[PDB]
Design a protein around this ligand. Structure first.
Ligand SMILES: c1cn2c(n1)ncc1nc[nH]c12
Ligand SMILES: c1cn2c(n1)ncc1nc[nH]c12
Ligand SMILES: c1cn2c(n1)ncc1nc[nH]c12
Ligand SMILES: c1cn2c(n1)ncc1nc[nH]c12
Ligand SMILES: c1cn2c(n1)ncc1nc[nH]c12
Ligand SMILES: c1cn2c(n1)ncc1nc[nH]c12
Lengths: 237, 237, 237, 237, 237, 237
C-alpha cells in the first residue's frame, strides 16, 4: 500500500485511465471493462482493474487539481508498476470554434501552477505528453470516426479565476481547453519516469457559460473513453 | 446547484467543517451530528447537514490540495450562504518539539502555490484565519483540557516534494505543520468576504518517527472535531 | 554592543516597544515608564529602559521601512535577549468602514518587499504576529473601552507607490492599514525565534483628505501605548 | 521589404527551412534545391528560394538566439505569407545515450528565456511544435531509415551558462538537446498565427566535451535536411 | 510641507547631501557650510541649508534602507525643487583589493529590493547615477589627492542576510561596496526626473574584522564630504 | 579556434568594436582601418583586424540579441585576450527630446532578458559599462564637436514586442535608446572580468517619425565610429 492507495503491486494494470471523478472511474469500469474488480477506495478515490478486449486495464479517479492528481500518479508510478497514465477529463473552452462535447488531446499543457518551476529551477518546463501516446489517440479517434483536436491545454489552479483577462491570453495562444491537471501529470511523468497523455471532453464554454450537468460529466463522455482504450491497443502493437 | 455540489440554498448550515477525505465527512456526521442528512454526493465528495447541541452544522469533504478545496469553499460561500469554513485535517510536523497528536491551529498559512500571488498582484498576501474563529478554537480546546499550538501552517502543492531542503526552511521559520489546503482556503475567504480557520492534528513527523496507538490517534482526531464544533458555539455567543 | 546599538546584554528588557519616529521613544519613557534610564543613542535612535507597574520595559525607535526595523529587531533579539517586540505606529486606511484614529492590530502583514521571499526560497511566507500577543492587545484594548480591529496590515516598501491600483486590491482583500514595517518585523521574529506584534492607529485615509486635531492625535497615541503596555502585563498572565 | 529582409511577397515559399547559420542555408540551397535564387542578404542573413522535387521551398538563416530568430520568423510570417517554419539546427546533448550526429525532433521546447512569460502573463506557456509537422518529420525519417528521437529541447539564452547544475536538471527531465531557438520560434508561431517545428543534429556533448568543427556544422548535417524536406512533401498530401 | 518634511519651497537648495545617520547632518552643516539655517526637524531628521564657497547646499539625513531614503528623496524632488541628491555614507567591501577607508563611487547599484521591479514591469532597471555627477566626484577626489574607485554598489534590504553565499556572487561580479540605499535613490531620481550619486567610504570588510581608529574615520568622512561638495562646484562648471 | 570563431590567439587586437551587422564590420574595417585582414568568417560573422592611427584594432559583428552577442564577447575575452568591447550600433528613441542622429552612450543598460538574473541569484544586477571607457567616449565626442548623451539603454529580447505599454515605462524612467545587446555584453564583461561600452546612434523614434537624409544618417554613423576609435586612443593614454 501507499499513503493514498490501499493496494499491492499487481493490483493495477500497467496502463491506468484516470478521470478526476471517482464516480466516472466506476462508470468506466462498469461500462467498458470486463471482470472489473475494485482495487482502492481510500478517501473514496475509487480504482478498478479489468480487461478491455482481453487487455488488462485499470481506471481510477485522481481528484481535482494538480496537487491531488500528482499524489495519485506518483504513487501509481513508484509503487504499482504503472507505465502509462491516460487522463480522461473535462475542460472549458475559450476558442469560439470549440464546442461542448468536442474531444481535445493535450500534446502540451500550459499552467499557472508553480509545480514545474519548483522542479525546473524556476525556468520554463514545456509540460508535454508522450508523442507515441498522442499519435495512438489520434489514430484511434480516426478509426472510430471521432473528431479530435491536438494542441495545448491550460492546467489552472483556480477554476474560479480572479483574472478573467487571462482567458483572452489563452485564446490568443490557441489553448484548446482549460482543465486542472495535465501540466502536473506531465511533470510527474517526467520526474518519476513514466509516460502520460491527457484527453478531455469540452464540458463548459467559458465565454458562453453553457455547461453540462454533473450527471452528464459523470456518465456521458463516452467518445473520449473509447479513444483512450483503443489507443492503448494501438500502443501495444 | 453548482457543477461540483448538487444542492440548493438552505441545504448547508452557515458553518461547514471540512476534512479532506469525504469518508471522514461521513464519519464526522455520524459520530457528532444528530438528524444528519446527506446533501451532496457529486464526485463522491460527501456532504452532510445535521445538528450539534441544537445548532445546525454541515460537514463536507474538500479533497486534497489548494485547487480542490478552492472550488468547494468558493461555491459554499457564493452559492450556499456559508459564512464560516473550518478545515479539520492532518498535518506533518517539522519541529522537534511538535509531537504526534498535537493540535495545531493555523492562524496563518505559508504556501508554495501561486494562487495568492495571482490574486494579489504578485506581492505577498499573508494568508490568515479569522481572528475570532482562532480565539474560539483556542478557548474550546482549553475548556476540553487541550493546549493547542497556534501559528503558521505550510500549505504544499507537492506532497512528494522534489525539494527536500524546504523542510529545513520550514523548521527554521517555525512552521507548526505541513498540509495542503489552508493558504488556499484563507485566500478564498478573503477574496469572497467570508471567514475561515484550519485546525490539524499531527499525523507524522516528516523526518523522524515516534510511536502512538490507533486508539490514541483516533481520540485526538475526535478532540479536534470537538474543538471545531464547540468553537462554533462560542462564536454564536 | 552591536553595529547599531551601543549597549550590553541586560540593558534592554525582554519586551521592547518600538515607534517609527525616534522622538516618540523619549516621550513614551517620560510619559509611561518609571525610573527610565538611557540605554542607546547611536544614530540618534534613543533607547530607554524603565518599568510599567513594576514590569521591565524598553522603548526605542525602529526607523522607517522594513530594512531599518529589520536591523534593530534582529540585534535586539540576538544580542540583547529580547523576546517580544511591539511596534506602535501609524497606518493609512483603504477600507471605507475603517475610520481615522481606529486602532488596528496586525495579526498578519502582507508586503511588496522581497525580504521574506529571500528567506523562504521564493515561496509565500505568511508574516504573522504571535497569537497570544494579538489576543493580549485585543483584551487590553477592551478593558480600556476601545474596540480594536484585528486582521492584515500591508507593509509597503514605497510610501509613494507608482501602482495606485494596488490600493484597490488591498481593499478587496480586507487590508486594515498600510504601513512600512510589520511584515519585516514578523519575518525577523520567525527567523530568530522571537515574538512580535504591530499595533497601528489610522492616521489618514489613502484616498481622502480628512483631518485630525493635535489633541486627538496625542490622545489616540497615548491610547495605543496604554494598550501595548497593558497587553504585556496580560501576557505575563 | 521588412526591417531585416529585403524581399517582397512571393519571394519566399510558404515553407522556410531555417538553420541558424546563413552559410548552412547557402549549402542547403546549393545541395538540395534546384534553380535556387538568393532572395535576401541584409545583415548577411542569406535566404534562398528554389524547388525540391518540384515543390517550392525556401531556406534562410535565422542567427543565434531567441531574439535573433524571433525577428526573422515574425517578418516571414507577417509580410511574406510563410505558413510553416522548420528550424534545422544544432544542439548539445546532456543524456548519456544521446550521441553526436543523432537527430532530435522537438515536440516541445523548455527555455530559460523570459519571452514566453512576457507573452503569457508570467505563467508557463508550453512551447510546442505543430503536431502534424512533428508526425510528418517522424514518418519522413522512418522512410529514410534515419533514427530520430521526439521530445523536449531546451532553448538556452546562454551558450556559456554560469549554471552548470542546470544541466543535471535538464538531464533529469529528459531534455534531448540544448539549443537556442525553438521555444522562441514556437512562441512566435503561436503569437503570429503560423506553424513551426525544430529538428536538430547533436553537434556537441555537454558532458564529454566532444564537439564537431565549424565546417562540419555548416556542410555535413545532411540527414536532418532530408528529413525536413521530405516531411514537407508528406504534409502537402 | 510634505508628510516627512516641515518646510516650504525655497528652504532647500537644489543640491542636497544626505548621510544615513541623521546626526551627521548637523556635523556637515557646522563643519563645512557657512550661514547654515535649520529647515527641518520632523522625526528628528534635521535638515540645514547654507553655502559652500558661495554655492547654496542643503544637508539632511535619509535614514537606513531603501524605503526610508525613497521617502525623503521623492519629497525633496517633487515638492522642494531639488535637482541633485548626493548620498554620502559607509559600505562594506567584498573584494580583497578594496581596502578599509577607500572611497567608492556608485556609477550603478545592484539590489535585492523589489522596488525597481515594481516600477519597471518586473524587468531589470539598471539603477544608475548621473554620469556628470560621477565624473565630477572622480575629478574632485583627484584634485584632493584621492583615487576613488567607480563601479557597482549593492544596495541590500537585509543588513543581516540569511544568504551568505550572495557575498561571493557580489565579489565575482565586481561589486565595490555593500550599502542599503543607492539603488533606491537612483530609482527615485529616474522616476521623478532628477539626478543622484552615492559616494561611500569602506567601513569594513564583510568577511574579516579589521579595525580603524576614530581619528581615521573622521578624516575619511571629512574627505568624502569635501569630495561631494567640490564635485558640486565642478558640476556648476 | 572556438565553435563560433575560426581564429587563433593574436589574430584579434585587445580592443574589438562590434556592430550587429557583419557587413557593417566590413564597412568599418574598409573605411577606418589600414592594413586590415579578415580574421573570422564562421557563420558569416565577419571579423577584421587592422590599425587606426598606428593602433591595432579589431572589428567584428555580434549578431542581433543578447544570446548572440553573449557568445562572441565571451569567446573574445576568454580565448582571444580581448580586454575591451565597444558595441557600435543603432537604437530607437522613446523620449521626445532625443532626436534622430543623437549619439547615445549606455553607461547602464536595462533589460527584459533573464540572463543577468541567472547570473545574480535572481536579484537586480545593474548592467554597467566601464567608467573609464565611458569617459574616453565622452571626451572623444567633445573633441569632435559632438555632444553625446550618457544614460540608460534598454536591451530588448523582442524587437516586435507584444507589450506596447513598456515603451511608456521606458520613457517615464528616462531610457535614452532601445537596442538588443548592451545589458548582455555588460553582463559578460562582469562575469569574465573585462570592460565594455555600448555607443548607439538613434535610427528611429519608436512612436513618431522625423525626417533626415541618408547622407546625414551615414555621417552620424561615421561619427559614432570615430568616437569609438578615438576613445581607445585616449584610454591608451
Ligand atoms: C472543466 C472546466 N473547467 C475546468 N474543467 N477546469 C478549469 C476551468 N476553468 C474554467 N473552466 C474550467
Ligand atoms: C499529513 C499531511 N502531510 C503530511 N502528513 N506530511 C507531509 C505533507 N506534505 C503535504 N501534506 C503533508
Ligand atoms: C500612515 C502611513 N502610511 C500612510 N499613513 N499612508 C500611506 C502609507 N504607505 C506606507 N505607509 C503609509
Ligand atoms: C549547439 C550546442 N549548444 C547549442 N547549440 N546551444 C546551446 C548550448 N549549450 C550548450 N551547448 C549548446
Ligand atoms: C557598512 C555597511 N554595510 C556594511 N558596512 N556591511 C554590510 C552591509 N550590508 C548592508 N550595508 C552594509
Ligand atoms: C534600432 C533598434 N531598435 C529600434 N531601432 N527600434 C526598436 C527596437 N527594439 C529593439 N531594438 C530596436
Amino acid at each position: 500500500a501507499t499513503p493514498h492507495i490501499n493496494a499491492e503491486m499487481g493490483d493495477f494494470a500497467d496502463v491506468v485511465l484516470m478521470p478526476g471523478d471517482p464516480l466516472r472511474a466506476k462508470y468506466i469500469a462498469e461500462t467498458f471493462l470486463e471482470d472489473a474488480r475494485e482495487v482502492n477506495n481510500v478517501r473514496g478515490m475509487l480504482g478498478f482493474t479489468g480487461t478491455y478486449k482481453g487487455r488488462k486495464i485499470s481506471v481510477m479517479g485522481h481528484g481535482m487539481g494538480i496537487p491531488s492528481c500528482s499524489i495519485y500518479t506518483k504513487e501509481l508510478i513508484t509503487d504499482f508498476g504503472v507505465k502509462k497514465i491516460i487522463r480522461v477529463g473535462s475542460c472549458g473552452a475559450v476558442l469560439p470554434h470549440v464546442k461542448l462535447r468536442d474531444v481535445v488531446i493535450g500534446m502540451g499543457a500550459c499552467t499557472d501552477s508553480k509545480v514545474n518551476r519548483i522542479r525546473f529551477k524556476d525556468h520554463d518546463f514545456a509540460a508535454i505528453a508522450d508523442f507515441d501516446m498522442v499519435r495512438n489517440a489520434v489514430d484511434a479517434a480516426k478509426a472510430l470516426g471521432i473528431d479530435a483536436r491536438v494542441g495545448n491545454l491550460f492546467s489552472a489552479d483556480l477554476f474560479y479565476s480572479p483574472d478573467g483577462e487571462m482567458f483572452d491570453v489563452m485564446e490568443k495562444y490557441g489553448i484548446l481547453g482549460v482543465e486542472m491537471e495535465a501540466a502536473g501529470i506531465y511533470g510527474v511523468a517526467a520526474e518519476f519516469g513514466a509516460k502520460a497523455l491527457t484527453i478531455c471532453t469540452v464540458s463548459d464554454h467559458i465565454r458562453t457559460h453553457e455547461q453540462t450537468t454533473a450527471a452528464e460529466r459523470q456518465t456521458t463522455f463516452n467518445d473520449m473513453i473509447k479513444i483512450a482504450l483503443e489507443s492503448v491497443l494501438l500502443g501495444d502493437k
